[PDB]
Amino acid sequence: ATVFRQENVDDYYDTGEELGSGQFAVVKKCREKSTGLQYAAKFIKKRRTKSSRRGVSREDIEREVSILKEIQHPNVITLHEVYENKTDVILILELVAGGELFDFLAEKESLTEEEATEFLKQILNGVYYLHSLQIAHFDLKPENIMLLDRNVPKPRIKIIDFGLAHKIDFGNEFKNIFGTPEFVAPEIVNYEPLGLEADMWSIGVITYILLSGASPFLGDTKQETLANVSAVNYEFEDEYFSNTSALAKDFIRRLLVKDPKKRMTIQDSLQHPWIKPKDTQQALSRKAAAVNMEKFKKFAAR
């Protein structure tokens, strides 16, 4: 294992209100005393004993930290420092204060597909960076797509929450069942080999929702959702996709593909004509098409 900083974090930071909390983690805003700069402190509860289920394993904490330490990119969250005490490992992280992307978009009166792709492209750039380092995020979904500051002319997207991320090992297949059913790829559902492709599936799902306000595979039970995912049971129902471009639907179709090897890669998604129009005709079609804002607002409010 790694020996993280052993000092009391309170000696170096002033901490305040909770910004969020998961099953084994609490996040608090904090201010570094030496610099006066604000960060987010994520307190992760250690398992401490192997037989206990009330915390995170050291293997899992070290994996997340090791991945965070490697990554430096404008569209992914930055790790500042790591502390630990008898009960917690404490990640001092870049503060992302602009809330979830979808909540910010939902406040708009309208959104063209052109404007939508400007935000989506930032997600793609962050994932392009990760995949270039052979890092799979494995938990891409709207609540992990944040804004650094929502009150600037061109808000910057930050991908957060690397708690499921893995460096892909060439010499050994990784198989695991994890994540949120609505957003995971068929190979996750079916305990099949996992790689960078699973993230691309998730991007397809995020894009589908962004444009329509509907979730492609969400069923009435967890089991039904997983069945929909495995069967790639989705539709572009006219109630939701009436003013969606052919290009946008093709983009999504090339991502929501059962066979990971046939799924569009991140490099190819960046060259797809919906993202990178090849002529004026394609450009105008994208600018003309619009997000179903009425339906989308209801999604963000769910």
- Measured distance CA(200)–CA(185) in Å, rounded: 9
Residue whose C-alpha is closest to residue 281's, from 245, 235, 255: 245
Q: Based on CB atoms, which residue is closest to Mg ion, 142 or 163?
A: 163
Q: Which of 88, 139, 169, 238 is catalytic?
A: 139
Determine if residue 20 is labeled as part of a ligand binding site: yes
Determine if residue 267 is labeled as part of a ligand binding site: no
- Which residue's CB atom is positioned nearest to Mg ion? 163
Determine if 163 is a binding residue for Mg ion (CB under 5 A): yes
- Measured distance CA(214)–CA(33) in Å, rounded: 45
Determine if residue 227 is labeled as part of a ligand binding site: no
Dihedral of the alpha carbons of 33, 36, 37, 42, in degrees to the nearest 10: 30
Residue span binding Mg ion (CB under 5 A) among the ranges 158-166, 195-203, 211-219, 275-283 = 158-166
* Neighbouring C-beta atoms of residue 50, cutoff 10 Å: 7
Contact present, 178 and 137 (Cβ < 8 Å): no
Site residues (CB under 5 A) for Cl ion, limited to 70-109: none
Instruction: Work out what residue 163 binds among Mg ion, Cl ion, none; the CB cut-off runs from 5 to 8 Å by kind.
Output: Mg ion
- Which residue's CB atom is positioned nearest to Cl ion? 226
Q: What's the min distance (Å) between Cβ of 285 and Cl ion?
A: 18
- Measured distance CA(214)–CA(212) in Å, rounded: 5
- Measured distance CA(117)–CA(111) in Å, rounded: 10
- Residue from 123, 226, 255, 290 in contact with Cl ion (CB under 5 A): 226
Determine if 55 is a binding residue for Mg ion (CB under 5 A): no
Site size toward Mg ion (CB under 5 A) is 1
Q: Based on CB atoms, which residue is closest to Mg ion, 163 or 204?
A: 163
- Residue from 15, 85, 112, 230 in contact with Cl ion (CB under 5 A): 230
Q: What's the min distance (Å) between Cβ of 162 and Mg ion?
A: 7
> Does residue 139 have an active-site annotation?
yes
Contact present, 21 and 81 (Cβ < 8 Å): no
Q: Based on CB atoms, which residue is closest to Mg ion, 55 or 163?
A: 163
Determine if residue 27 is labeled as part of a ligand binding site: yes
Q: Tokens for 291?
A: 């997000």
- Measured distance CA(293)–CA(208) in Å, rounded: 13
Determine if residue 23 is labeled as part of a ligand binding site: yes
Q: Based on CB atoms, which residue is closest to Mg ion, 67 or 247?
A: 67
Burial of 237 by CB count in 10 Å (0-12 exposed, 13-18 middle, 19+ buried)?
exposed
Determine if 216 is a binding residue for Mg ion (CB under 5 A): no
Residue span binding Mg ion (CB under 5 A) among the ranges 98-106, 130-138, 160-168, 281-289 = 160-168
Instruction: Work out what residue 226 binds among Mg ion, Cl ion, none; the CB cut-off runs from 5 to 8 Å by kind.
Output: Cl ion
Q: What's the min distance (Å) between Cβ of 178 and Cl ion?
A: 6
Contact present, 120 and 210 (Cβ < 8 Å): yes
Distance between terminal CA atoms of the chain?
41
Contact present, 244 and 267 (Cβ < 8 Å): no
Q: Which run of H or E residues covers position 117?
A: helix 113-132
For binding to Cl ion (CB under 5 A), which residues are involved? 37, 226-227, 230
For binding to Mg ion (CB under 5 A), which residues are involved? 163
Which residue numbers are catalytic? Answer: 139
The binding site comprises 19-27, 42, 94-96, 100, 161
